[PDB]
């Protein structure tokens, strides 16, 4: 839950997709980072605040971004200046979500209890109540400052509250041009606390002394340029309007307001160790809309990194591409769709659907749709979750095709040793995952493109152990689909229906015949010395072993030769001539294998001898058993295995 921050974000995205009212994609971002910083502060250890401080700041930024995207878009045709409205959006997040010390404890009853008659600790208790009131007013606590000013006998501060309440009645209107020049002159008079000296300059739009700013934090530090522009833009337009008159004016005001970049050149220069933090500098880029300019700049200095930034920049583009179509750079979009799917490795199991909302071109083309062919191995949970998100047809025909064609180039080293052994454990451990993508795509129409993948690996077996026999067992783990591919094949029209349905049916008969010979050869070899002294059951079983084999040989010779001779698709004939030429000698030795173990019973001698001696004699009428010796090299092997019967049968 709390640990899976990415999962929470994904859920919010999913809800929006179901609905497809558009301002709800970013509002859910305020419920994630909040519960996280709350789960490390409600109960638990106190040292977790070293990580909760990162969550205590990533949530206030999502609040400031929600007011900027709705002002420049949701312009309803209801019943002027569009750039001055940004100052109001900056004041809402700069006033509501600010730090405020609570009310002071042990407030004195009467005044001057220790009594130039007051001690040094009396102006401090007066400045303590002065700072408690100088802070609440800066955060918009009129409702609280108005009661706070009346409560502490602090009547010296109430005279300006209504002056602000009179300035608030003039701001809602959108004379007082002379009242702005008196407080600035009051800020140049001596005799004021440091907290009250900064309060008079902040309301008008002036700069106070630097000794009061030293205490001021570099984050808060930004309200100085915000209040000056307001005091100057209203005096400019106010000046333009001139609704006070020249006489009402007293002193010249800096009515030349600067831009955002000239103000940011000074806030990150007063307290740069914290004003340029990676979670606070993102608010200037929302006014510039440059997405891949802050993350792709941390991949070059590899000689000398922050996961919270990659999750927000990538989540911004899915909204930036949606808020304004193509607002995110097209290069940045595909660079964000690729950096997200790659960084989402520890959490790639559930986000296999959230990457489709911004398909764009990385998904329509074989770009962002080929990475799923690298993790879908054994677990059946991720294979079924991708079935949602409204994706099928060609995407299913492009993920299954990219799953079997992308591993065919890696088996190129498996066709070089045509006369030696090799390391086939990886092929016997990675090709098993190469059959779950097609077995999961239970489509009777997309069966022709995958039914040939097993026959394409018969030549990688070569001598010694064969990989097709183990591959024949993977197909037995999911048969019956032959009935689904034969019924769905009569649904779509096809012209060459006299050769496409005959190759699939003949390959299934040879493979099932091959899987049967492998299991028949595993039961006679596992016999060894079975039945012990009671060979009566073996006298009939070995009789069945010797009959089922003498029949299997004549049957396997007729299945491979059933391909006739002259055919146009001779590429399928030159590949099956070796597999047929490789299943011949292994049968004659099994009857002879009853002359090493069943030789303790002089019964397989007169039988297994002539049974294998004529196996080459009748293998001379059907075109001399073709030339299985010409396709494998096993000629003298047959000459010696049978020649040995002249020192045992006599």
């Amino acid at each position, epitope marked *: 839950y709390q640990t899976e921050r990415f999962t929470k974000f994904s859920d*919010t995205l999913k*809800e929006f997709k179901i609905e497809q009212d558009p301002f*709800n994609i970013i*509002r*859910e971002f*305020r*419920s994630a980072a909040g519960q996280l910083a709350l789960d490390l502060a409600n109960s638990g250890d106190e040292s977790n605040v070293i990580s909760s401080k990162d969550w205590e700041l990533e949530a206030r930024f999502w609040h400031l971004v929600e007011l900027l995207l709705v002002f420049r878009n949701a312009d309803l045709d209801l019943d002027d200046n569009k750039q001055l409205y940004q100052i109001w959006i900056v004041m809402v997040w700069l006033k*509501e979500n600010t*730090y*405020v*010390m*609570e009310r002071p404890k042990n407030v004195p009853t009467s005044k001057w209890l220790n009594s130039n008659v007051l001690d040094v600790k009396d102006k401090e208790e007066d400045h303590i109540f002065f700072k408690y009131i100088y802070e*609440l007013i800066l*955060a*918009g*606590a*009129i*409702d*609280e400052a*108005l*009661e706070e000013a009346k409560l502490s006998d602090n009547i010296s501060i109430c005279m300006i509250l209504c002056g602000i*309440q009179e300035y*608030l009645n003039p701001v809602i209107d959108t004379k007082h041009s002379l009242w702005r020049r008196t407080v600035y002159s009051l800020s140049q008079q001596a005799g004021l606390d440091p907290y009250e000296r900064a309060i008079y300059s902040y309301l008008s739009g002036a700069i106070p002394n630097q000794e009061v700013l030293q205490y001021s934090d570099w984050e808060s530090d930004l309200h100085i340029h915000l209040n000056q522009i307001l005091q100057t833009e209203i005096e400019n337009y106010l000046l333009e309007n001139n609704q006070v008159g020249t006489d009402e004016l007293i002193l010249p005001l800096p009515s030349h307001a600067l831009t955002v970049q000239e103000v940011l050149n000074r806030v990150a220069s007063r307290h740069p160790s914290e004003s340029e933090h990676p979670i606070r500098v993102l608010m200037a880029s929302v006014i510039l809309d440059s997405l891949p300019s802050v993350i792709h700049s941390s991949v070059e200095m590899l000689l000398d990194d922050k996961p919270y930034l990659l999750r927000i920049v990538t989540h911004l583009a899915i909204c930036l591409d949606i808020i304004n179509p193509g607002s995110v750079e097209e290069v940045d979009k595909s660079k964000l769709i690729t950096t997200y799917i790659s960084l989402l490795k520890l959490q790639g199991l559930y986000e296999n659907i959230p990457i489709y909302a911004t398909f764009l071109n990385e998904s329509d083309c074989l770009e962002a749709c080929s990475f799923i062919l690298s993790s879908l191995e054994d677990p059946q949970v991720r294979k079924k979750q991708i079935e949602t998100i409204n994706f099928l047809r060609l995407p299913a025909s492009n993920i299954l095709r990219r799953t079997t064609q992308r591993v065919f180039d890696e088996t190129e080293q498996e066709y070089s040793p045509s006369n030696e052994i090799s390391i086939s454990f990886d092929v016997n451990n990675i090709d098993m995952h190469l059959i779950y993508g097609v077995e999961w795509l239970i489509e009777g129409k997309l069966y022709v493109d995958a039914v040939h993948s097993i026959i394409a690996l018969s030549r990688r077996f070569l001598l010694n152990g064969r990989v097709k026999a183990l591959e024949q067992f993977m197909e037995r783990n999911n048969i019956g689909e032959i009935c689904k591919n034969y019924e769905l094949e009569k649904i779509a029209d096809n012209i060459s229906k006299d050769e496409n349905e005959d190759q699939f049916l003949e390959e299934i008969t040879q493979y099932e015949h091959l899987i049967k010979g492998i299991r028949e050869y595993e039961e006679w070899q596992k016999s060894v010395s079975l039945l012990s002294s009671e060979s009566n059951i073996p006298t009939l079983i070995e009789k069945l072993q010797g009959f089922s084999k003498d029949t299997f040989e004549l049957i396997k010779t007729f299945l491979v030769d059933l391909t006739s001779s002259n055919f146009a698709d001779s590429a399928d004939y030159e590949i099956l001539y070796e597999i047929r030429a490789l299943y011949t000698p292994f049968l004659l030795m099994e009857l002879h294998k009853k002359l090493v173990e069943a030789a303790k019973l002089l019964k397989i001698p007169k039988f297994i001898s002539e049974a294998l001696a004529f196996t080459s004699l009748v293998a001379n009428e059907n075109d001399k058993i073709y030339l299985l010796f010409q396709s494998s090299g096993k000629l003298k092997e047959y000459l010696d295995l049978v020649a040995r019967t002249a020192t045992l049968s006599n």
Partner: nanobody
Amino acid sequence: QLQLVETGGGLVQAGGSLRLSCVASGWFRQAPGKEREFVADYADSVKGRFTISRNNDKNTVYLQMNNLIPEDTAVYYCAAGQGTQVTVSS
């Protein structure tokens, strides 16, 4: 430390009334599963039935919810809050 103390929520029937008071120790709604939407300016789903409690200067101007329906069962938060549950049974 904007101790925003909210109270007044509860469980009512379809058609009842409630009065949510919010005292800023120093009105948006969230349904179960959806995103935080603004209630009180008045939302189109509560215009004519609710009365917001926003006041100028130091004036809470606390006001309620009349003719409550099952579409208003959610957690209400205050903004200028921890949350107060207001459920309405059908």
